[PDB]
Amino acid sequence: LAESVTEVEIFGKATSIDPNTYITWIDKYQAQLVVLSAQIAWSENVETALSSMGGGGDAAPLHSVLSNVEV
């Protein structure tokens, strides 16, 4: 889990994910592990976006998280 989250944190904080590296990462770790890593990365990204959105809707990175999820 530690190694997989270390990889998916790199994956999430990027755009236009390369299919080859994503497929290799999926193959590397178990299904339970890959799902848990995805959930952990999403939770941390949403938490840091909310923390950075303390002032309000100004400079909202939640749209960036949604775009990452869409990609």
UniProtKB/Swiss-Prot annotation:
Subcellular location: Cytoplasm, Cytoskeleton
Domain of life according to the entry: Eukaryota
Domain notes: Dynein heavy chains probably consist of an N-terminal stem (which binds cargo and interacts with other dynein components), and the head or motor domain. The motor contains six tandemly-linked AAA domains in the head, which form a ring. A stalk-like structure (formed by two of the coiled coil domains) protrudes between AAA 4 and AAA 5 and terminates in a microtubule-binding site. A seventh domain may also contribute to this ring; it is not clear whether the N-terminus or the C-terminus forms this extra domain.
Function per UniProt: Cytoplasmic dynein 1 acts as a motor for the intracellular retrograde motility of vesicles and organelles along microtubules. Dynein has ATPase activity; the force-producing power stroke is thought to occur on release of ADP. Plays a role in mitotic spindle assembly and metaphase plate congression.
Disease: Charcot-Marie-Tooth disease, axonal, type 2O: An axonal form of Charcot-Marie-Tooth disease, a disorder of the peripheral nervous system, characterized by progressive weakness and atrophy, initially of the peroneal muscles and later of the distal muscles of the arms. Charcot-Marie-Tooth disease is classified in two main groups on the basis of electrophysiologic properties and histopathology: primary peripheral demyelinating neuropathies (designated CMT1 when they are dominantly inherited) and primary peripheral axonal neuropathies (CMT2). Cortical dysplasia, complex, with other brain malformations 13: An autosomal dominant disorder characterized by global developmental delay with impaired intellectual development. Some patients show signs of peripheral neuropathy, such as abnormal gait and hyporeflexia. CDCBM13 is associated with variable neuronal migration defects resulting in cortical malformations.
Family: Belongs to the dynein heavy chain family.
Assembly with partners or alone: Homodimer. The cytoplasmic dynein 1 complex consists of two catalytic heavy chains (HCs) and a number of non-catalytic subunits presented by intermediate chains (ICs), light intermediate chains (LICs) and light chains (LCs); the composition seems to vary in respect to the IC, LIC and LC composition. The heavy chain homodimer serves as a scaffold for the probable homodimeric assembly of the respective non-catalytic subunits. The ICs and LICs bind directly to the HC dimer and dynein LCs assemble on the IC dimer. Interacts with DYNC1LI1; DYNC1LI1 and DYNC1LI2 bind mutually exclusive to DYNC1H1.
Name of the protein in its database record: Cytoplasmic dynein 1 heavy chain 1
Provenance organism: Homo sapiens
Lineage: Eukaryota, Metazoa, Chordata, Craniata, Vertebrata
Gene that this sequence comes from: DYNC1H1
